[PDB]
Scaffold this active site. Structure first.
Site, mmCIF file in Angstrom:
data_model
loop_
_atom_site.group_PDB
_atom_site.id
_atom_site.type_symbol
_atom_site.label_atom_id
_atom_site.label_comp_id
_atom_site.label_asym_id
_atom_site.label_seq_id
_atom_site.Cartn_x
_atom_site.Cartn_y
_atom_site.Cartn_z
ATOM 1 C CG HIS A 18 -1.664 -1.265 1.428
ATOM 2 N ND1 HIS A 18 -2.672 -1.660 0.575
ATOM 3 C CD2 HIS A 18 -1.547 -2.245 2.354
ATOM 4 C CE1 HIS A 18 -3.142 -2.831 0.968
ATOM 5 N NE2 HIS A 18 -2.475 -3.209 2.044
ATOM 6 C CD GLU B 80 -3.710 9.643 2.638
ATOM 7 O OE1 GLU B 80 -3.372 9.594 3.838
ATOM 8 O OE2 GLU B 80 -4.311 8.717 2.059
ATOM 9 C CG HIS C 146 0.681 10.540 6.708
ATOM 10 N ND1 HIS C 146 -0.375 9.851 6.149
ATOM 11 C CD2 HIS C 146 0.454 11.849 6.452
ATOM 12 C CE1 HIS C 146 -1.205 10.708 5.582
ATOM 13 N NE2 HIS C 146 -0.726 11.927 5.752
ATOM 14 C CB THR D 134 -5.694 8.263 5.499
ATOM 15 O OG1 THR D 134 -4.338 7.817 5.382
ATOM 16 C CG2 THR D 134 -5.736 9.598 6.233
ATOM 17 C CB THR D 135 -4.969 2.872 5.136
ATOM 18 O OG1 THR D 135 -4.452 2.413 6.395
ATOM 19 C CG2 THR D 135 -3.997 3.862 4.527
HETATM 20 C C1 LIG Z 1 1.081 -2.860 15.306
HETATM 21 C C2 LIG Z 1 0.739 -1.908 14.200
HETATM 22 C C3 LIG Z 1 -0.268 -2.261 13.251
HETATM 23 C C4 LIG Z 1 -0.614 -1.338 12.225
HETATM 24 C C5 LIG Z 1 -1.701 -1.833 11.284
HETATM 25 N N1 LIG Z 1 0.062 -0.058 12.163
HETATM 26 C C6 LIG Z 1 -0.265 0.940 11.065
HETATM 27 C C7 LIG Z 1 -1.586 1.676 11.278
HETATM 28 C C8 LIG Z 1 -1.724 2.986 10.535
HETATM 29 C C9 LIG Z 1 -2.505 3.061 9.327
HETATM 30 C C10 LIG Z 1 -2.625 4.327 8.639
HETATM 31 C C11 LIG Z 1 -1.966 5.494 9.162
HETATM 32 S S1 LIG Z 1 -2.186 7.124 8.371
HETATM 33 N N2 LIG Z 1 -2.194 6.951 6.796
HETATM 34 O O1 LIG Z 1 -1.041 7.934 8.702
HETATM 35 O O2 LIG Z 1 -3.517 7.590 8.734
HETATM 36 C C12 LIG Z 1 -1.199 5.398 10.369
HETATM 37 C C13 LIG Z 1 -1.077 4.151 11.049
HETATM 38 C C14 LIG Z 1 1.074 0.277 13.130
HETATM 39 C C15 LIG Z 1 1.827 1.587 13.186
HETATM 40 C C16 LIG Z 1 1.412 -0.654 14.145
HETATM 41 ZN ZN LIG Z 2 -0.631 7.800 5.822
#
Ligand SMILES: Cc1cc(C)[n+](CCc2ccc(S(N)(=O)=O)cc2)c(C)c1
Ligand SMILES: [Zn+2]
EC number: 4.2.1.1
Length: 258
Positions: A62, A104, A117, A196-197
């Protein structure tokens, strides 16, 4: 097949598996500068990445994540609209297939070439997992990218993309200093929103910097050489991995300046 950015699995399809996609505090949003109001109750924003320790860079299909060691208090975001300390866990970008689009969040409907981000979680919740179960569990520092002169501090990231062209690949990436990605000014707009995802969880306090950083056409061009697909699969260039602006609803965007 899961969510993506295509015609059949893109943003307009997410609500089916993730209903909150139509929630009350979704991100991103358009930042109407004239409607944003200066907020004196905001404390000076504090970004301390001096001790930041990067570990690995990953292509998750992604975008690509530069992950950091968040087992200790190193690289924290404080002040501003934030209460307490938030710890940097990773940073990634969103970009387009053309310079005219990619970010975004938008400014008065203006779309930047890309958006960075820097993701942080509220330390009072133990870790990321627990943090994403809270309305104030996260804080993402957004920085816009525009095409112009190169950004020296982004080059090391650019040159490693060759090793993680496809989904699933990752490469060691220690000693990367995220401080080389920040503009001069820390003026910013802030509002309560979401990831945002998918899962699009509404646990984020967004802090979007006014001043964007400049990257070279060559640099963003390499972002566009990455793949959505995995190794040995038909090539699908990793481009336009951004979600469109969502309805503001009952929210007010505050400005840290004037
Ligand atoms: C354990 C763990 C599992 C996941 C899915 N994630 C990512 C989650 C995530 C998804 C989208 C944005 S965003 N695009 O900046 O809104 C920020 C963090 C992290 C940072 C740790
Ligand atoms: Zn992002």
């Amino acid at each position: 097949h899961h969510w993506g950015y295509g015609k059949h699995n893109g943003p307009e399809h997410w609500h089916k598996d993730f209903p909150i996609a139509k929630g009350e505090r979704q991100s991103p949003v358009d930042i109407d500068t004239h409607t944003a109001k200066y907020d004196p109750s905001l404390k000076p924003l504090s970004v301390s990445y001096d001790q930041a320790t990067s570990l690995r860079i990953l292509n998750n299909g992604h975008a690509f994540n530069v992950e950091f060691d968040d087992s200790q208090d190193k690289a924290v975001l404080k002040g501003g609209p934030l209460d307490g300390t938030y710890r940097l866990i990773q940073f990634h970008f969103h970009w387009g297939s053309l310079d005219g689009q990619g970010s975004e969040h938008t400014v008065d409907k203006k779309k930047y070439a890309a958006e960075l981000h820097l993701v942080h979680w509220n330390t009072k919740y133990g870790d990321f997992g627990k943090a994403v179960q809270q309305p104030d569990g996260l804080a993402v520092l957004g920085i816009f990218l525009k095409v112009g002169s190169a950004k020296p501090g982004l080059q090391k990231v650019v040159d490693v993309l060759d090793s993680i062209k496809t989904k699933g690949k990752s490469a060691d990436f220690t000693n990367f200093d995220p401080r080389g990605l920040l503009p001069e000014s820390l003026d910013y707009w802030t509002y309560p929103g979401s990831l945002t995802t998918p899962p699009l969880l509404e646990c984020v306090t967004w802090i979007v910097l006014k001043e964007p950083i400049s990257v070279s056409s060559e640099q963003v061009l390499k972002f566009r050489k990455l793949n959505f697909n995995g190794e040995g699969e038909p090539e699908e260039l990793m481009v336009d991995n951004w979600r469109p602006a969502q309805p503001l609803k009952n929210r007010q965007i505050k400005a840290s300046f004037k």
